[PDB]
């Protein structure tokens, strides 16, 4: 019988839960309505940096992830300062719904 051909995950949406440490969430975000897009014409919010061995890294967040929701509140159409505020106010466990195109 013929060899199995492995599957290929092309893209995903996933929810990562970051446990805030004294230093913060261990990420930078970039983007926002009216701002210079992080990617193409997409004015959304993206994870632009992930601190090595910080909380986000341990939670499985990756640079390039598009940040769709913070604790269930959608960031679609948000300005940069609004996304920063959502994240700073998200409490101890921060559920991050992201879109990941690079596997």
């Amino acid at each position: 019988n013929l060899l199995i051909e492995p599957a290929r995950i092309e893209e995903e949406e996933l929810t990562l839960t970051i446990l805030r440490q004294t230093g913060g969430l261990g990420i930078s975000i970039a983007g926002g309505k009216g701002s210079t897009p992080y990617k193409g014409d997409d004015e959304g919010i993206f994870i632009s940096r992930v601190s090595e061995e910080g909380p986000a890294a341990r939670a499985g967040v990756r640079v390039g992830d598009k940040l769709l929701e913070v604790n269930g509140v959608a960031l679609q159409g948000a300005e940069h300062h609004e996304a920063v505020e959502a994240l700073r106010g998200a409490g101890t466990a921060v559920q991050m719904r992201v879109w990941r195109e690079r596997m």
């Binding site: 970039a30 920063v84 700073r88």
Partner: peptide, 8 residues
């Protein structure tokens, strides 16, 4: 306009 990036 600016590229906006913030550590959180």
């Amino acid at each position: 306009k600016h590229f906006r990036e913030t550590e959180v």
